[PDB]
Amino acid sequence: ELVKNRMKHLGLPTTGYDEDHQNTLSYVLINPPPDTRLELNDIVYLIRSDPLA
Amino acid sequence: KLIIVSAETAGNGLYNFIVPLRAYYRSRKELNPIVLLLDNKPEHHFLEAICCFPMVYYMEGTIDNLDSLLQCGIIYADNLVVVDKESTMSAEEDYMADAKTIVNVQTMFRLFPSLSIITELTHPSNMRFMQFRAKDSYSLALSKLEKKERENGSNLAFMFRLPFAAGRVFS
Amino acid sequence: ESTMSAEEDYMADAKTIVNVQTMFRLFPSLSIITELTHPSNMRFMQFRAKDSYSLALSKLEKKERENGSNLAFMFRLPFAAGRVFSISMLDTLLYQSFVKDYMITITRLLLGLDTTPGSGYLCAMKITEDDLWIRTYGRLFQKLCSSSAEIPIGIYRTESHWISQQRLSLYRRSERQELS
Amino acid sequence: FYVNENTFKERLKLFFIK
Amino acid sequence: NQRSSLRIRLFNFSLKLLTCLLYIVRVLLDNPTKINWSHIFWVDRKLPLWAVQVSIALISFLETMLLIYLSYKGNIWEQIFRISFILEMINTVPFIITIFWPPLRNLFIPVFLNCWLAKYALENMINDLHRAIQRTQSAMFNQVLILICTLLCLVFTGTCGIQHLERAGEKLSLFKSFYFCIVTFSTVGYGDVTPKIWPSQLLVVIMICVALVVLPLQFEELVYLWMERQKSGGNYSRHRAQTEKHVVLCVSSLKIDLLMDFLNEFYAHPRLQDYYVVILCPTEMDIQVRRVLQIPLWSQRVIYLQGSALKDQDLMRAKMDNGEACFILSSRNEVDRTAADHQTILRAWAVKDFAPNCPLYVQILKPENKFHVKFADHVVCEEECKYAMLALNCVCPATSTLITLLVHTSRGQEGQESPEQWQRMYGRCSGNEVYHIRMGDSKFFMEYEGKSFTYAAFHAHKKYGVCLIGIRREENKSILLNPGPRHIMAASDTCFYINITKEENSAFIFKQVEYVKGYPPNSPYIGSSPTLCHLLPEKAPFCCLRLDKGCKHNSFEDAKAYGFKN
Amino acid sequence: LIYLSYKGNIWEQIFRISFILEMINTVPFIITIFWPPLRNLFIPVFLNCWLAKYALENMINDLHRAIQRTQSAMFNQVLILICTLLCLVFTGTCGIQHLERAGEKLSLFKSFYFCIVTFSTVGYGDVTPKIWPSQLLVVIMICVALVVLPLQFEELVYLWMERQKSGGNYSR
Structure with a gap:
């Protein structure tokens, strides 16, 4: 309610305020073995090739 | 989704933020927009450099003032x-x-749990104050291991501290 | 700050005391609510050339502190009247809160900060010449409780304890006449 | 003060210590 | 290594003491103008006492050989010319010579210098414990242990040395040399025991020069480490903490103004008198506060320990996890307000991370910082309460005084000796204090269950003289200050009342423009209490708030021109 | 006194120095009541000197309930520093006088001469110890003297010299 009241003061829509709550442990595995299973929403780091060459 | 940055002055370091992005x-x-929230007003040495890059802006105020943040659009912003x-x-x-960077992030942590944050610290000794709750489940458990690691002769003791592993903190 | x-x-x-001391002389009718960081600066608050209760009250509070009293500054006259107040006076509140969990919540309900739906507030009924009809505090408890469902905590008393004509007029003019 | 002050212990405690 | 290294230090340390121990044995066992140098060189040692020292010498000789191979970094002259190696080769190599040569078993070897090699083992052993880096209290005691060894090993070398040379003439025992040595180092000089031989004279000349340089520096460094542990150090032990009660006080800098108000308040209660009050504070012991802690009462009770609440080592000194309370207090009269409050938030988080089960009592100055320590059990904002008193002092006459006297715990024995009428009754009524007891349990409020709250309040004050304030229900956690006639009492309703003494203690009484109501939209801080405040229908402009300059709305320069009623 | 200030741990109170010096002195006198031949047996009652000092420190600090007394704090603290010097000498005199009975029998005054000479680091050797126990006592007494006494004098001089600059009272 503190934000939504202040949004109307500034003159902004409070439609997508919630879009919400977080409780997730997180970490980074650098160069694992090939047998390691990949879970859902596991963001992998990628060294891309050159776009031009 | 928007990116938003907070700093004292618009120095030549913040040019080096925007170049690799x-x-x-x-x-x-994919191009994420950028908004440089600043305490002091920026000089023309910065403005002429940043000018050429697309959809990058600046705004006055601080993280402390909730009015300053909501103008910049932190609700749908991806990364503080x-x-x-x-x-x-x-x-x-x-x-x-x-102290003030920790306390101002702690309000943002409660107000906007969806909002991901990328906090800075001068010392890694202030890691324990970053994200704070009344749970204390992994707070004592992770502290036990890193103290035992430092006794064994480990380079990375602070590694196991949870905020660092997630990438939310960096020094 | x-x-x-x-x-x-x-x-x-220093400056809060000296600026109040001018206001004390200029406007004696004007009631004041002064603040102090330390209660050690109580003795400088209201100042006169009387010194009747100044030494007498100082004797008791020094003897109280030797006996092992919490409230030594109590007997100092400015404090009892409510003219003075300090931050260190309600620092004791937090230390009392160890034995009494409720103590903070009940204090704020009296002050009117954390007001729940079913709550009260502090008021002030001055006993005028009409109210002298009731003489005792016990009989005052009856009328307030029976009629309007009010409960009293305590009471605040106030006991009693051109050339020729122009030149001579300014010389005889007293300090109170100058300030007016 | 009946519970605190008026006891066999605290009579002696006030006499010696307090 | 940590574990594998330390055992080898203790192994060498024990062997080097064993050689010096075997030297004490042979002196006591083996006993017998010109100087007889025979008694210096030739020494009739026993074969078993010899053989054990040789086996120890071979082990310690090989340890120095092996250690060179490990830490050889170019220069061998760097390792050989050191003192630890020279003292090894003076002692151990002659024992190896006695294996090959059969007549040299009786020849003297100064094995007593292994005392200093044992000290070099202890310094090497002790500093293996500083891989954890931070151990401030353990650093002081273990450093003192080495300073004691230097004093003993200097005496041991002196005793043995002088006892050996005096064999030539005026034959002293081991104890007479110890008497002689400690007298000469102390600069007393009795001359009861003396040296009268050419070598022994020269040794005592050297021993005095070594003593007068080293020993005073050893004692003054010893006293420095000993006296620093008094101010800085102090550990609340496990044996004390587990059995006894225990409370902590986190603070930036203590004073008499702060401490005496706390200690008198805390120990005023009967059930709290057995507790122990530990302090945590980064600054050192003040001159004023040291007199208060020296008093017999607070000498046993209070334990001042230096160190901030943020570092986890200083929390292990106090041992908060065991204790039943952790008071945190903001530093008033500091150069910056916001920095002081930000520190108490970090202290609160430092305490909660280490010890979650402790009930966190906290004091903060500014109201905006309340939200960050709202997780804590009990919070007292100074700014919120301060300005609330002054607001009530406008409506009511002296609420500032009213609240101060309730919270300060005292009893009715203040200003009774004074001659004035008001002053006796004022100090008696100052003893009043808020309490809480259930209906059914309370002897005050027995026959008042069916009747209302208001009815009970009169009859309580009429009979006993104990007025009620409010009630807490079983279901509702909230306190309700003065219900009217609607609230009927129950069996288990917590009655809050004001009395000089608590019921359970007090047996002596029994025997003897329009406005619109609404919540203000813009709260300037996060954790704020919403209330109905007679709001304006229209939201006023910023110009109309100012008096000095009359804007285009109501042009009034001074406050008298507005025409304020009341 | 144990019944009054018992707060969980009795090991906290028994292992203190004030209690140990009590049990060394007072308990043997209680044993002589029950046992009739032990009246002639020696009890080192002289250590009550330090128990009297512990009483004085406990007595003096009852006057700091008024908190502020800056001039009285300096003189009464100096009085304790004088007691430590006297009680260290008294324990030395009595101790050395007792052991020297075995051989070379000194009087009470000769031991006082002997003690104050040994603490001062003069070492005349006019009076000396020549017995196995007495030798070991003097070795201990010098170690206690050379650590304590210089710290006592320099703290005594600190409090004495501070009263010159800071102190000074215009009398009645």
Whole structure:
């Protein structure tokens, strides 16, 4: 309610305020073995090739 | 989704933020907008450099003022980027060097749990104050291991501290 | 806030004392609610050339502190009237809160900060010449409780304890006449 | 003060210590 | 290594003491103008006492050989010319010579210098414990242990040395040399025991020069470490903490103004008198506060320990996890307000991370910082309460005084000796204090269950003289200050009342423009209490708030021109 | 006194120095009541000197309930520093006088001469110890003297010299 009241003061829509709550442990595995299973929403780091060459 | 950055002055370091973000190898539709929230007004040495890059803006105020943030559009913003402010760098104790950056992030942590944050600290000793709750489940458990690691002769003791592994903190 | 930080206790609240002392002489009818950082600066608050109760009240509170009293400054006259108040006076609140969990919540309900739906508030009924009909505090408890469902905590008493003509007029003019 | 002050212990405690 | 290294230090340390121990044995066992140098060189040692020292010498000789191979970094002259190696080769190599040569078993070897090699083992052993880096209290005691060894090993070398040379003439025992040595180092000089031989004279000349340089520096460094542990150090032990009660006080800098108000308040209660009050504070012991802690009462009770609440080592000194309370207090009269409050938030988080089960009592100055320590059990904002008193002092006459006297715990024995009428009754009524007891349990409020709250309040004050304030229900956690006639009492309703003494203690009484009501939209801080405040229908402009300059709305320069009623 | 200030741990109170010096002195006198031949047996009652000092420190600090007394704090603290010097000498005199009975029998005054000479680091050797126990006592007494006494004098001089600059009272 503190934000939504202040949004109307500034003159902004409070439609997508919630879009919400977080409780997730997180970490980074650098160069694992090939047998390691990949879970859902596991963001992998990628060294891309050159776009031009 | 928007990116938003916080700093004391718009120095030549913040040019070096925007260069690797705005790159030819990055996709055009992927291009995240940038908003540099600043305490002091920026000079023309910065403005002429940043000018050429696309959809990058600046705004006055602080992280402390909730009015300043909501104008910048932190609700649908992907990443807040709090940076060590040059005035508060110099301090006698380790706690008072980064007290205000910790407390202002702690309000943002409660107000906007969806909002991902990228906080800075001068010392890694202030890691324990970053994200705070009344749970204390992994707070004591992770502290036990890193203290035992430092006794064994480990380089990376702070590694197991949870905020660091997630990438939310960096020094 | 600028004058809060100081090395000595005197220079922390010097200017607030001296500026109140002018207001005390200029406007004696004007009631004041002064603040002090330390209660050590109580003795400088209201000042006169009488010194009747100044030494007498100082004798008792020094003897109280030897006996092992919490409230020594109590008997100092400015405090009892409510003219003075300090931050260190309700620092005791937090230390009392160990034995009594409720103590903070009940204090704020009296002050009117954390007001729940079913709550009260502090009021002030002055006993005028009409109210002298009731003589005792016990009989005052009856009328307030029975009629309007009010409960009293305590009471606040106030006991009694051109050339020729122009030149000579300014010379005989007293200090109170100058200030007016 | 019946519970605190008026006891066999605290009579002696007031006499010796307090 | 940590574990594998330390055992080898203790192994060498024990062997080097064993050689010196075997030297004490042979002196006591083996006993017998010109100087007889025979008694210096030739020494009739026993074969078993010899053989054990040779086996120890071979082990310690090989340890120095092996250690060179490990830490050889170019220069061998760097390792050989050191003192630890020279003292090894003076002692151990002659024992190896006695294996090959059969007549040299009786020849003297100064094995007593292994005392200093044992000290070099202890310094090497002790500093293996500083891989954890931070151990401030353990650093002081273990450093003192080495300073004691230097004093003993200097005496041991002196005793043995002088006892050996005096064999030539005026034959002293081991104890007479110890008497002689400690007298000469102390600069007393009795001359009861003396040296009268050419070598022994020269040794005592050297021993005095070594003593007068080293020993005074050893004692003054010993006293420095000993006296620093008094101010800085102090550990609340496990044996004390587990059995006894225990409370902590986190604070930036203590004073008499702060401490005496706390100690008198805390120990005023009967059930709290057995507790122990530990302090945590970064600054050192003040001159004023040291007199208060020296008093018999607070000498046993209070334990001042230096160190801030943020570092986890200083929390292990106090041992908060065991204790039943952790008071945190903001530094008033500091150069910056916001920095002081930000520190108490970090202290609160430092305490909660280490010890979650402790009930966190906290004091903060500014109201905006309340939200960050709202997780804590009990919070007292100074700014919120301060300005609330002054607001009530406008409506009511002296609420500032009213609240101060309730919270300060005292009893009715203040100003009774004074001659004035008001002053006796004022100090008696100052003893009043808020309490809480259930209906059914309370002897005050027995026959008042069916009747209302208001009815009970009169009859309580009429009979006993104990007025009620409010009630807490079983279901509702909230306190309700003065219900009217609607609230009927129950069996288990917590009655809050004001009395000089608590019921359970007090047996002596029994025997003897329009406005619109609404919540203000813009709260300037996060954790704020919403209330109905007679709001304006229209939201006023910023110009109309100022008096000095009359804007285009109501042009009034001074406050008298407005025409304020009341 | 144990019944009054018992707060969980009795090991906290028994292992203190004030209690140990009590049990060394007073308990043997209680044993002589039950046992009739032990009246002639020696009890080192002289250590009550330090128990009297512990009483004085406990007595003096009852006057700091008024908190502020700056001039009285300096004189009464000096009085304790004088007691430590006297009680260290008294324990030395009595101790050395007792052991020297075995051989070379000194009087009470000769031991006082002997003690104050040994603490001062003069070492005349006019009076000396020549017995196995007495030798070991003097070795201990010098170690206690050379650590304590210089710290006592320099703290005594600190409090004495501070009263010159800071102190000074215009009398009645």
